[PDB]
Structures are given as C-alpha cells and as structure tokens.
Amino acid sequence: ENVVSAPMPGKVLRVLVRVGDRVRVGQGLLVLEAMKMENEIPSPRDGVVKRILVKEGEAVDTGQPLIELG
Template sequence: MRYFAKLQGQKEAVPVDIEPAGENRFKLTHGGKTFLVDALTLDHGAVSMLVDGTSYSVEFDEQGDEVLVSVRGQVNRIDVADERRLRLRAATAGFSVEGKQLISAPMPGKVVKVLVKQGDEVKEGQGLVVIEAMKMENELKSPKAGKVVELLAKEVTAVEINAKLVVVE
C-alpha cells in the first residue's frame, strides 16, 4: 500500500510503499531504496523493529492525521496519508459531503476499537472505528457531521478490504 509521509518542516510529502513480506515482516520502499522490516508490537505498546539488521524500539502516538514517532530519544511529527486520504483532502477542500456516507475498511485487518454507538451524533473528522493492519492502527473518521445510522463494526473481528463498517447520515 502506498502512503505519503511529510516530516514537520518539509514542503512536500514523499511516497512510501509498504508490502507484507510474511508474518510480522514488511518490504518498505522509500526514495528508491527497499528495506526489509521485521516488526513486533511489545506489551507496553512500542514496536520493536529490525530494519536490514539494525534494531530499533519505536513508539507511535497518533494525533489526527499526524503521527508522533519516537526513535532513539528523538521525536518526529509526520503527516501520514494514503492515496485515498489525499484525494479526500483535495476533494473536501472546497465543499463538504452530503447524504449517507459509507465508511468501509481501506484494507484487510482487525477492528480493535469501535468509538461510537448506533444513533450517536458525530462531528466531521470524529473518529468512528480503529482498525489494525500491518501492525499499525488506523482511525477511520467521519467524513461529515451527522448521525450514525448503521454500525456493523464489532471489536476484535477481522474485516476484509471494503467491508462496510459504519454509515453516517
């Protein structure tokens, strides 16, 4: 899957491709270089990563579309977006969405948190469901203010790509 990452202070986001390469292993391609990454989530929430033979303990703190990444005592703020999110940002810059909005799984994974209940009033950008995929948690947000009219996501269940999770009207 292709992501675009922009470090705080950089003008442009750079593409980063992440592909599964076995259990807890990924191929990460950035700047024309490919790295083999072994990733294991530790009990206290940090991720132990082995990148081309070098070990790192990495902590992530999601703050909206940004992620604070702590590695070896240095914290970096990174704006991370997949191609879909970039298109949504561009599309919503001038107008807001109307009508029923279906929020579906952008990739196969596991629902780790359901942040709303059916009937809840939600704000645009409010978190609805958290999905874990490739050892990363992705918070799916409401594309508009409205009411949760359908809630199909259930915690600790596996979902396939494009699985229907929430409908906001």
C-alpha cells in the same frame, strides 16, 4: 446518508461510537489494526451514526462497510 468502508484489511479493535451518536468530519469512528499500525478510521462528514456494521475483534477486508451514517 452514506457508508464508511475499511481502507485496508485489519481487525476492529474498538468502535468509538454508538448508534445515534452525532459525529464530526475527521472524528474517529473505530480503530483498525493494520499496516503494523493502529489506524483510527474517521467519519468523512458531520452526521449521525445510523448503523454499526462490525463488532470489536472482527476481521474486515478492504472496502468492507463498517458504519452507515444517517
């Protein structure tokens, strides 16, 4: 069980998972608007989504917890 944090500042455009979802390493967890780019933030490992820490439309800062895996 670990925490996925924002790699840079940006706005959450969409959360691609729901609590309880099984995720694969490298699979997209959410999309972050930043570096004039749309960046798909991956899961660092296979696992289950335990908690979603941000909402779509919300601004986040570097290092901010976004998803907690079980």
